[PDB]
Structure formats: structure tokens, C-alpha cells
């Protein structure tokens, strides 16, 4: 089949039920609007796990599900197998991405 990799993305809860559109390098996009990010007990966050067993990288996108999206400004974010954290530009940032879930 493939190497079978997994990609975790944790986005801060800024809405309640925000959607996240992800696409494995060489795969297909998710059911737009992306997929509803699971609940992150972290402390009011969201979690999402997507497998890329066949892709060395996977793209992700943020969207409130309403009518506001957020992808690499206006394209789509890219992440490599593992765990990444997504936070809103609390100031003048344009969607911040980190490598590794938050530790509270």
C-alpha cells in the first residue's frame, strides 16, 4: 500500500466548529468545506488527524465553515507527517503554524 503516515493538526478554537481542508500530496482534497476539526480538550482547541500514507507531505486549510477561509493567505498550507499547531494571527499575523501540539 504505502508507508502509512499520519498528520495531526491542532487549531485554536476561535469559532466553535471550524472546518479544516487537507489534501495529501498526490491525493485529493477533502469534502469541502474541508473537515470539521475534532474537539481539543487542550483548553478550547480543535484537533484533526489525516493520513498521508503515500505522500511525504500534506496540505491543510482553515475555514470557519461560514464563508471565511484561510489558506497560505490564499492558496493552502503545507505540512509534513507528524503534528502541527495552527493559531490565528493574534495581531498582524496570517495564520501561524507550529511543529508540535501545544503543551497547555
UniProtKB/Swiss-Prot annotation:
Extent of the Sequence repeats: 1-104
Protein name from the UniProt record: Beta/alpha-amylase
Source organism per UniProt: Paenibacillus polymyxa (Bacillus polymyxa)
Membrane-spanning parts: none
UniProt similarity note: In the N-terminal section; belongs to the glycosyl hydrolase 14 family.
Compartments in which it is found: Secreted
Biased composition, class Polar residues, residue ranges: 90-99
Function noted in UniProt: The precursor protein is proteolytically cleaved to produce multiform beta-amylases and a 48 kDa alpha-amylase after secretion.
Chain positions covered by the region annotation Disordered: 90-104
Amino acid at each position: 500500500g504505502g508507508t502509512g503516515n499520519k498528520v495531526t493538526i491542532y487549531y485554536k478554537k476561535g469559532f466553535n466548529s471550524p472546518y479544516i481542508h487537507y489534501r495529501p500530496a498526490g491525493g485529493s482534497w477533502t469534502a469541502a468545506p474541508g473537515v470539521k476539526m475534532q474537539d481539543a480538550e487542550i483548553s478550547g482547541y480543535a484537533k484533526i488527524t489525516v493520513d498521508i500514507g503515500s505522500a511525504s507531505q500534506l496540505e491543510a486549510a482553515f475555514n470557519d465553515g461560514n464563508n471565511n477561509w484561510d489558506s497560505n493567505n490564499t492558496k493552502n498550507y503545507s505540512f509534513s507527517t507528524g503534528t502541527s499547531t495552527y493559531t490565528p494571527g493574534n495581531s498582524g499575523n496570517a495564520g501561524t503554524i507550529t511543529s508540535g501540539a501545544p503543551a497547555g
